[PDB]
Swiss-Prot record, chain A:
HAMAP family referenced in this protein's UniProt entry, alphabetically: ATP_synth_alpha_bact
Taxonomic source organism: Saccharomyces cerevisiae (strain ATCC 204508 / S288c) (Baker's yeast)
GO biological process: one example: proton motive force-driven ATP synthesis
Protein name, as recorded: ATP synthase subunit alpha, mitochondrial
Gene3D superfamilies in the record: 2.40.30.20, ATP synthase alpha/beta chain, C-terminal domain, P-loop containing nucleotide triphosphate hydrolases
Function: Mitochondrial membrane ATP synthase (F(1)F(0) ATP synthase or Complex V) produces ATP from ADP in the presence of a proton gradient across the membrane which is generated by electron transport complexes of the respiratory chain. F-type ATPases consist of two structural domains, F(1) - containing the extramembraneous catalytic core, and F(0) - containing the membrane proton channel, linked together by a central stalk and a peripheral stalk. During catalysis, ATP synthesis in the catalytic domain of F(1) is coupled via a rotary mechanism of the central stalk subunits to proton translocation.
Curated annotation (Swiss-Prot), chain B:
Organism, as annotated: Saccharomyces cerevisiae (strain ATCC 204508 / S288c)
Location relative to the cell: Mitochondrion; Mitochondrion inner membrane
Origin superkingdom: Eukaryota
Family designation: Belongs to the ATPase gamma chain family.
Biological function: Mitochondrial membrane ATP synthase (F(1)F(0) ATP synthase or Complex V) produces ATP from ADP in the presence of a proton gradient across the membrane which is generated by electron transport complexes of the respiratory chain. F-type ATPases consist of two structural domains, F(1) - containing the extramembraneous catalytic core, and F(0) - containing the membrane proton channel, linked together by a central stalk and a peripheral stalk. During catalysis, ATP synthesis in the catalytic domain of F(1) is coupled via a rotary mechanism of the central stalk subunits to proton translocation.
Gene behind this protein: ATP3
UniProt subunit comment: F-type ATPases have 2 components, CF(1) - the catalytic core - and CF(0) - the membrane proton channel. CF(1) has five subunits: alpha(3), beta(3), gamma(1), delta(1), epsilon(1). CF(0) has three main subunits: a, b and c.
UniProt name for this protein: ATP synthase subunit gamma, mitochondrial
Phenotype for residue 47 to T: In ATP3-1; dominant suppressor of the slow-growth phenotype of yme1 strains lacking mitochondrial DNA
Extra information: Present with 28100 molecules/cell in log phase SD medium.
Curated annotation (Swiss-Prot), chain C:
Sequence positions bearing Phosphothreonine: 72, 197
GO CC term, one of those recorded: mitochondrial inner membrane
Protein's gene: ATP2
Subcellular location: Mitochondrion; Mitochondrion inner membrane
GO molecular-function term, one example from the UniProt record: proton-transporting ATP synthase activity, rotational mechanism
Keyword set, alphabetical order: ATP synthesis, ATP-binding, CF(1), Hydrogen ion transport, Ion transport, Membrane, Mitochondrion, Mitochondrion inner membrane, Nucleotide-binding, Phosphoprotein, Transit peptide, Translocase, Transport
Domain of life: Eukaryota
PROSITE patterns in the record: ATPASE_ALPHA_BETA
Protein name per the record: ATP synthase subunit beta, mitochondrial
């Protein structure tokens, strides 16, 4: 049946095996075969063993060529023939990987058919030049209201999501991806961000849940999941973000926009540590290899918004860094912080206090920031930044007889903090972010009891939806808030406040 | 008259205490940071020696 | 034809085997013909047996062993000329401004040896500046190293831009802004911005030359961008007699790049993960920063210290070289001052009585005492109340807040950015202003009459205008 189709395919291989250069393992220990042969081999070239193992050739030494095996050592033994495939690593790139969970090689680990994508293009290629870029100005809206306002994000830029282990770091990230469904539905292909999630060291059960959740929210059809799971070998892990980046290049080159979330480069680091140590290259600061800066930098400048002559496109990126004790002082965090252009630092205490998003507002910055912010949201949340600044100082005033101004700030601030809570795995529309924050700015929400903020929010949104979805759509489509709209909004809020 | 002065003094003392504790915090923090570097170095030396042999 | 075949490609450390007695010397530049154009390898060892060990500048990915290499014969020779101002240049001396082949006169080796004891500065000189804060509390000095601290953007880069404008007025000098570990997106903005503010005009004149060394460029090329830049500057200084001001970006990324190359070379990186040849690498670079008899280089460097640790050996080594430190404060920018400069944390070692002139010194000491007292007084004065100021103390507060406003002085480049045409203030006239303010000639003149103005002459005008 299906068996017959496979046998036919086997009949369809019979190719002349005149391997111009073969190799023989001299000794294989530690997944570091030292091969005799491979005279004309290119560096990092893909090699196929008798065991069928795939490798890269980091060391080209004069007497031996030190293959690093991608495969397991289990079948490998000394003397093994090493065919020289003669092709440096390449992975299929194209829109073929939309809704496809693939390993680095390109094998569909979800088995959603053999990947048919436009071309297979090599894993490593150097980052775009100065003149091949044009400055960011296009927002991207993550649905997370706080992210969109406090640290507004744009296109073809890097900005961290650096935070403490298992705080559902992936949950914060996943929320962005979900909101991209709304924009994805939208026609403009800059609004179609074809997300790439790079699950690094993440156990297959966890990624299966991720996949399932994505399927539940029907997100697998702009999503691409490059998977190097916990089991997946340190070469695969090492080349995994690079491989992923190339997939992104097809979109970027096609002028479209897309978002690649490298999660977490901290586990990428460990894999490089393993590799370096196995090649006995000295391990850098904090026993994390010395060229880790170089490695991360090579990857991270591929995230770029190309020039309009390069067909205004981008590969937005949002690297995730895991802070073991919360130490941004840790060598890999410090390096990465320097490399990137913004960081968002989730606060563990806030997470524990159930404030999800758990964002540490002070330790979150975006350098592009308000350049890539919706004008409407900019107007109604410049105020929010200043209010929160006061609220931070007046946080300690929560220890009481307080100045009336201080006590007012404390009330206004507490209501705001609750407003910026957004239950995990439920994005919000921008046209509904802007009215709510306006209310808070006008202090309408201050009066509303803290417990009734929640009831107020959903109700207000429906109230607005009923009363004037003409306004909401107008606000949405204009993307700006005119004095007439803000006027109407203050009034509308007053009407809602009465109920 | 006394009670107001008493509470005023309590506030004053407790404020100045927060400051004094802060100064000491800073002094031991710098020492901590240096000590951290030293641990890294001592470990690093062990690794270097190991690699060397 | 000195040629050799590649016999290893372990990392970016490429060992090349040359035929007997046809061996390059150390620091020579080798060019391997490639579909990458060339790969430039710099000979960093002789391993003997007619083989060498070299480092690469351009990436070695997909390199095939046994490929013939051609030896240039000496450290890379990079184009120089007045023509080359206004070119973004990569490490290998090729246009990355993409406005085509660099129009060049002469080309010159990237490595160069520091001038002799005799040709070092025998007596200090004070380079003119136009920022008053700079001209009082940390006057620039020819051959000096001035290490920037504080955030970029509205901070460092705008400050750097101002300096180019000022230098053009001051001498007619040139610059080369060399950016190491440069985020290419940010660099693009800076280039475009530099074009916009006309310090680069390629439809006009471009004083500053750009060398941008992105982080994605290999560590070897990160190390060599600086040496190249200094050579360009030296062509101006020595061979066009110019006085120039050469910006360097992060020396953390200078260190970082060098550290890797050492470790790759197998040399034990010293404590705090910094190369054993750390001292020498700064030493060669920052002893080529000097006032020669022909000209003088002066270098403004940006000193980004990792983790705020000045205890780290690389920052310490930098501070040894540093003659001044400019410590931009964001608090200061928030006090509506552009200058963003923190006056009390800005210090220079060339500020000494004789060095800056006795009058200048005495005025400076008074201004330091005034500011020092103003800050300290304001600490408990705010708490206690402003009416708890003594007559003397509120005289000082009155004067001081007038000085605080006097600090505000727009920058010429920031004519657009603040919206107010910059106020260039010459060093002598800065002293004059402060003498008068100290003598309270302007303590009967309003605070915001000093807001966003320049020298003594400027505040005569504004004193009248604020009222009228």
């Amino acid at each position: 049946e299906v068996s017959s189709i496979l046998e036919e395919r086997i009949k369809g291989v019979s190719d002349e095996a005149n391997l111009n250069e073969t190799g023989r393992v001299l000794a294989v220990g530690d997944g570091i075969a030292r091969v005799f042969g491979l005279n004309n081999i290119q560096a990092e070239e893909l090699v196929e063993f008798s065991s069928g193992v795939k490798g890269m050739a980091l060391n080209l030494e004069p007497g031996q060529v030190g293959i690093v095996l991608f495969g397991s050592d289990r079948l490998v033994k000394e003397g093994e023939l090493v065919k020289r495939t003669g092709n440096i690593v390449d992975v299929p790139v194209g829109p073929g990987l939309l809704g496809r969970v693939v390993d680095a090689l390109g094998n569909p680990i979800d088995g959603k058919g053999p990947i048919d994508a436009a071309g297979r293009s090599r894993a490593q290629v150097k980052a775009p030049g100065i003149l091949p870029r044009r400055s960011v100005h296009e927002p991207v809206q993550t649905g997370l209201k706080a992210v969109d306002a406090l640290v507004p994000i744009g296109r073809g830029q890097r900005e961290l999501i650096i935070g403490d282990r298992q705080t559902g770091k992936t949950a914060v990230a996943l929320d962005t991806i979900l909101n991209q469904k709304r924009w994805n539905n939208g026609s403009d292909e800059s609004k179609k961000l074809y997300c790439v999630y790079v699950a690094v060291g993440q156990k297959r059960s966890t990624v299966a849940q991720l996949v399932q959740t994505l399927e539940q929210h029907d997100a697998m059809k702009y999503s691409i999941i490059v998977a190097a799971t916990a089991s997946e070998a340190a070469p695969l892990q090492y080349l995994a973000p690079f491989t992923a980046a190339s997939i992104g290049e097809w979109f970027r080159d096609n002028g479209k926009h897309a978002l690649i979330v490298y999660d977490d480069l901290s586990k990428q680091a460990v894999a490089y540590r393993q590799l370096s140590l196995l090649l006995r290259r000295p391990p850098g600061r904090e026993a994390y290899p010395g060229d880790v800066f170089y490695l991360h930098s090579r990857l991270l400048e591929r995230a770029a918004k190309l020039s309009e002559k390069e067909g205004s496109g981008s590969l937005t990126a949002l690297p995730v860094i895991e802070t073991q004790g919360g130490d941004v002082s840790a060598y890999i965090p410090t390096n990465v912080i320097s490399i990137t252009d913004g960081q968002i630092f989730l606060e563990a205490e806030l997470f524990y206090k159930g404030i999800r998003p758990a964002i540490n507002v002070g330790l979150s910055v975006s350098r592009v920031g308000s350049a890539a912010q919706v004008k409407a949201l900019k107007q109604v949340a410049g105020s929010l930044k200043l209010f929160l600044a006061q609220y931070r100082e007046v946080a300690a005033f929560a220890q009481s007889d307080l100045d009336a101004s201080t006590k007012q700030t404390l009330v206004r601030g507490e209501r705001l903090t609750q407003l910026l809570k957004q239950n995990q795995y439920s994005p919000l529309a921008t046209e509904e972010q802007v009215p709510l924050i306006y209310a808070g700015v006008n202090g309408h929400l201050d009066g509303i009891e803290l417990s009734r903020i929640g009831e107020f929010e959903s109700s207000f949104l429906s109230y607005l939806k009923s009363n004037h979805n003409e306004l909401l759509t107008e606000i949405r489509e204009k993307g700006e808030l005119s004095k007439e709209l803000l006027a109407s909004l203050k009034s509308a809020t007053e009407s809602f406040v009465a109920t | 008259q006394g009670y107001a002065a008493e509470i005023s003094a309590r506030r004053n003392a407790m404020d100045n205490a927060s400051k004094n504790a802060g100064d000491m915090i800073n002094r031991y923090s710098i020492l901590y940071n240096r000590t951290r570097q030293a641990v890294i170095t001592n470990e690093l030396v062990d690794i270097i020696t190991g690699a060397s042999s | 034809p000195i040629t050799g075949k590649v016999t290893a490609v372990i990392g970016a450390i490429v060992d090349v085997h040359f035929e007997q007695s046809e061996l390059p010397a150390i620091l020579n530049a080798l060019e391997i013909k490639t579909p990458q154009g060339k790969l430039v390898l710099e000979v960093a060892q002789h391993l003997g047996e007619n083989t060498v060990r070299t480092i690469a500048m351009d990436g070695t990915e997909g390199l095939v062993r046994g490929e013939k290499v051609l030896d240039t014969g000496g450290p890379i020779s990079v184009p120089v000329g007045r023509e080359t101002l206004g070119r973004i240049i990569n490490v290998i001396g090729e246009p990355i401004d993409e406005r085509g082949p660099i129009k060049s006169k002469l080309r010159k080796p990237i490595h160069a040896d520091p001038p002799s004891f005799a040709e070092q500065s025998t007596s200090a000189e004070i380079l003119e500046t136009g920022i008053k804060v700079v001209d009082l509390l940390a006057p620039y000095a020819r051959g000096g190293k001035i290490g920037l601290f504080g955030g970029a953007g509205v901070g460092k880069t705008v400050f750097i831009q101002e300096l180019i404008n000022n230098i053009a007025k001051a001498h007619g000098g040139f610059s080369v802004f060399t950016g190491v570990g440069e985020r290419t997106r940010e660099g693009n903005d800076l280039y475009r911005e530099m074009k916009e503010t006309g310090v680069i005009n390629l439809e006009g004149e471009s004083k500053v030359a750009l060398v941008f060394g992105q982080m994605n460029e290999p560590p070897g090329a990160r190390a060599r961008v600086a040496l190249t830049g200094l050579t360009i500057a030296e062509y101006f200084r020595d061979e066009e007699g110019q006085d120039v001001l050469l910006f360097i970006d992060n020396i953390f990324r200078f260190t970082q790049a060098g550290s890797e190359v050492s470790a790759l070379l197998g040399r034990i990186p010293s404590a705090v993960g910094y190369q054993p040849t750390l001292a020498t690498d700064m030493g060669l670079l920052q002893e080529r920063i000097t006032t020669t008899k022909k000209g003088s280089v002066t270098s403004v460097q940006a000193v980004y210290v990792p983790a705020d640790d000045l205890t780290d050996p690389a920052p310490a080594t930098t501070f040894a070289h540093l003659d001044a430190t400019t410590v931009l404060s964001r608090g200061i920018s928030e006090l509506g001052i552009y200058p963003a400069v923190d006056p009390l944390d800005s210090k220079s070692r060339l500020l000494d009585a004789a060095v800056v002139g006795q009058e200048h010194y005495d005025v400076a000491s008074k201004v330091q005492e005034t500011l020092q007292t103003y800050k300290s007084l304001q600490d408990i004065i705010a708490i206690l109340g402003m009416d708890e100021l003594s007559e003397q103390d509120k005289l000082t507060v009155e004067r001081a807040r007038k000085i605080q406003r006097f600090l505000s002085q727009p920058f010429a480049v920031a004519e657009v950015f603040t919206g107010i045409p910059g106020k260039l203030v010459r060093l002598k006239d800065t002293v004059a202003s402060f003498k008068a303010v100290l003598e309270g000639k302007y303590d009967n003149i309003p605070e915001h009459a000093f807001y966003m103005v320049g020298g003594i002459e400027d505040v005569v005008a504004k004193a009248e205008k604020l009222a009228a």
